Amino acid sequence: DGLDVSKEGTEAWEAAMKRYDERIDRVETRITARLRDQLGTAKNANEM
Amino acid sequence: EVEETLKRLQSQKGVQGIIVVNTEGIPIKSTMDNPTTTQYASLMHSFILKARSTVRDIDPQNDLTFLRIRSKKNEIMVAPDKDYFLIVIQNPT
Amino acid sequence: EVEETLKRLQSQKGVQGIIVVNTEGIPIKSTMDNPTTTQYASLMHSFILKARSTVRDIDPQNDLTFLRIRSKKNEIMVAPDKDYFLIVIQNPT
Amino acid sequence: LTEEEKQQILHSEEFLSFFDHSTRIVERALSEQINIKLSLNRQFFDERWSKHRVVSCLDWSSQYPELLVASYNNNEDAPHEPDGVALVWNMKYKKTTPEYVFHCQSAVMSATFAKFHPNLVVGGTYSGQIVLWDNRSNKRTPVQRTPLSAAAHTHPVYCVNVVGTQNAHNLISISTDGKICSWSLDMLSHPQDSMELVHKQSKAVAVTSMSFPVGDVNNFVVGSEEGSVYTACRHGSKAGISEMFEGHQGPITGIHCHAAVGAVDFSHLFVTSSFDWTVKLWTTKNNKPLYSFEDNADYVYDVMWSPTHPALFACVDGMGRLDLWNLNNDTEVPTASISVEGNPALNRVRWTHSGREIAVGDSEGQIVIYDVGEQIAVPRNDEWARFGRTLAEI
């Protein structure tokens, strides 16, 4: 979607962006998993 | 050009310019420590004279311009033309 | 081995003559004739002894492990370590 | 015969045969063939002079990179024992004993080699007298001793360093009160120049560390005891402090300019080791601390750059760890880090002028020579550009 003026075009863009955000949240889960499995050491810098 | 030969011999690895020793055993050119170079060059002169005697014993038409004296630390190439005896210290590597 | 050694050391350039010398000079082996080998190798033995002293002058720990003399008419070899004294007669080129 | 006829005979033009012979032998002799991490490296710990008496300063000789000057300061075990002791320890051969020993009546706080005299050790003491030690002399006492007059230092000196060219030297020293003085290395009865460091009118400075940018002698950087680093000019109309740095909220216990050359210049950068475990990668042209590495519970004591790595720098600690920070590699965790046994308070780090291996002082006099891995020690040609990018990051 671009200069498209159809509001149903905006709704289709919303569907595209909720798929976007599903990939985003997959990335969030992966990075937070990396977080938690890399935590538990201490507070300082790369620990927390 | 003397300085051209100096820079050319300097280019050779392990070599400090050009040093030339005359028939007196005293180097006509100064590049290394004077007492050591003079005594060592007198020794070279003695050995090249005796080697010349032997080569003339059986080869009365031969001339010496190349002699490879290498140890496990350094090598000397000594080259007599008729009076000037070039001596170049060069690492075996 | 002996014969294989001299054969490989000779055919490497079709050398005119080489004999094995494991003693201090005065070799009884021959390749062309007895005199020109024995007397010449004895004189080479004396001179490599003097050269050993010559190279020990700069530092006693140094030793001569290899000697070339490539002159206008002869190209004479020796590789002394403790008693192995090579002789090689070959063209200068 | 003598050295005059040789000149004419060389000037003679029969040298065509000689030059041809030389060219031929050289061209024929051109062909040449053959005939056929962090690691504890060494210790150094006397017992006669190194019972307690924590290390204070370290150095390496430029002329003799195999030599280390120490200075064990504190006399508390035995009042009758010598008060200040500076030991010099050799690197070429392993000996349990120090090579040479020097003791001063007062307590030595800092010591360093002499560039002009490669056979001399200069050190500063706690009383305030700059102290020599002529290694030629057989006598352990100071050889030449600066007077404790109002002309010279009267407060505990903490930085001494000889700089300049071999034909034009100056021994700079700075004391806690801030009176900088340059002496001639050969004559110290009078300070050939002196000036009391002061900030904006009527503001004394409690100097406790310094470093000169490489090459420059005219301007330098000083770390004050009041946690505010300054840059000053040694000679010029503006001789004295010329800069405010907000710096850090604790005493500055170390300082060091950048120590690498060859590619894009970084002399403007330096690192200060504060008193709250905050080393500060940070430059003269700016005023704001470029970055503020922080960790730990205790606080650092000294920090130096690597003399050949344009990024690496060591870091003392209170519980005894020595760590190396490789900015190009990483800015957040120490790239390397190992702890000395017994966890005492380390007090001085000094890198070899080669930069291939590190030294470290100690709270018990046991100087430790540590070695670093090749991949973590020697940089690359691209390493400088990578440092440029990392600094351009923010």
From Swiss-Prot, chain A:
It is found in: Cytoplasm, Cytoskeleton. Residues 10-33 form a coiled coil. It comes from the Eukaryota. Cytoplasmic dynein 1 acts as a motor for the intracellular retrograde motility of vesicles and organelles along microtubules. Dynein has ATPase activity; the force-producing power stroke is thought to occur on release of ADP. Plays a role in mitotic spindle assembly and metaphase plate congression. It is linked to Charcot-Marie-Tooth disease, axonal, type 2O: An axonal form of Charcot-Marie-Tooth disease, a disorder of the peripheral nervous system, characterized by progressive weakness and atrophy, initially of the peroneal muscles and later of the distal muscles of the arms. Charcot-Marie-Tooth disease is classified in two main groups on the basis of electrophysiologic properties and histopathology: primary peripheral demyelinating neuropathies (designated CMT1 when they are dominantly inherited) and primary peripheral axonal neuropathies (CMT2). Dynein heavy chains probably consist of an N-terminal stem (which binds cargo and interacts with other dynein components), and the head or motor domain. The motor contains six tandemly-linked AAA domains in the head, which form a ring. A stalk-like structure (formed by two of the coiled coil domains) protrudes between AAA 4 and AAA 5 and terminates in a microtubule-binding site. A seventh domain may also contribute to this ring; it is not clear whether the N-terminus or the C-terminus forms this extra domain. Belongs to the dynein heavy chain family. This is Cytoplasmic dynein 1 heavy chain 1. It comes from Homo sapiens (Human).
UniProtKB/Swiss-Prot annotation, chains B, C:
InterPro entries: DYNLRB1/2, Roadblock/LAMTOR2_dom. GO terms for cellular component: centrosome; ciliary tip; cilium; cytoplasm; cytoplasmic dynein complex; dynein complex; membrane; microtubule. The keyword Cytoplasm applies. Its main location: cytoplasm. The keyword Cytoplasm applies. Gene3D superfamilies: Dynein light chain 2a, cytoplasmic. It is found in: Cytoplasm, Cytoskeleton. Keywords: Acetylation, Cytoplasm, Cytoskeleton, Dynein, Microtubule, Motor protein, Transport. High expression in heart, liver, brain and pancreas; moderate in placenta, skeletal muscle and kidney; low in lung, prostate, testis, small intestine and colon. Isoform 1 expression is up-regulated in 64% hepatocellular carcinoma (HCC) patients. One of its GO terms (biological process) is visual behavior. One of its GO terms (molecular function) is dynein intermediate chain binding. Belongs to the GAMAD family. Homodimer. The cytoplasmic dynein 1 complex consists of two catalytic heavy chains (HCs) and a number of non-catalytic subunits presented by intermediate chains (ICs), light intermediate chains (LICs) and light chains (LCs); the composition seems to vary in respect to the IC, LIC and LC composition. The heavy chain homodimer serves as a scaffold for the probable homodimeric assembly of the respective non-catalytic subunits. The ICs and LICs bind directly to the HC dimer and the LCs assemble on the IC dimer. Interacts with DYNLRB2. Interacts with DYNC1I1 and DYNC1I2. Acts as one of several non-catalytic accessory components of the cytoplasmic dynein 1 complex that are thought to be involved in linking dynein to cargos and to adapter proteins that regulate dynein function. Cytoplasmic dynein 1 acts as a motor for the intracellular retrograde motility of vesicles and organelles along microtubules. This is Dynein light chain roadblock-type 1. It comes from Homo sapiens.
Curated annotation (Swiss-Prot), chain D:
One of its GO terms (cellular component) is cytoplasmic dynein complex. One of its GO terms (biological process) is microtubule-based movement. WD repeats lie at residues 50-99, 103-143, 152-193, 202-242, 247-292, 295-335, 341-380. GO terms for molecular function: dynein heavy chain binding; dynein light chain binding; microtubule motor activity. Keywords: Acetylation, Cytoplasm, Cytoskeleton, Disease variant, Dynein, Host-virus interaction, Intellectual disability, Microtubule, Motor protein, Phosphoprotein, Repeat, Transport, WD repeat. It is found in: Cytoplasm, Cytoskeleton; Cytoplasm. Pyrophosphorylation by 5-diphosphoinositol pentakisphosphate (5-IP7) promotes interaction with DCTN1. Serine pyrophosphorylation is achieved by Mg(2+)-dependent, but enzyme independent transfer of a beta-phosphate from a inositol pyrophosphate to a pre-phosphorylated serine residue. It is linked to Neurodevelopmental disorder with microcephaly and structural brain anomalies: An autosomal recessive neurodevelopmental disorder characterized by global developmental delay, severe intellectual disability, microcephaly, dysmorphic facial features, and cerebral malformations including simplification of cerebral gyration, agenesis of the corpus callosum, and brainstem and white matter hypoplasia. Acts as one of several non-catalytic accessory components of the cytoplasmic dynein 1 complex that are thought to be involved in linking dynein to cargos and to adapter proteins that regulate dynein function. Cytoplasmic dynein 1 acts as a motor for the intracellular retrograde motility of vesicles and organelles along microtubules. The intermediate chains mediate the binding of dynein to dynactin via its 150 kDa component (p150-glued) DCTN1. Involved in membrane-transport, such as Golgi apparatus, late endosomes and lysosomes. This is Cytoplasmic dynein 1 intermediate chain 2.
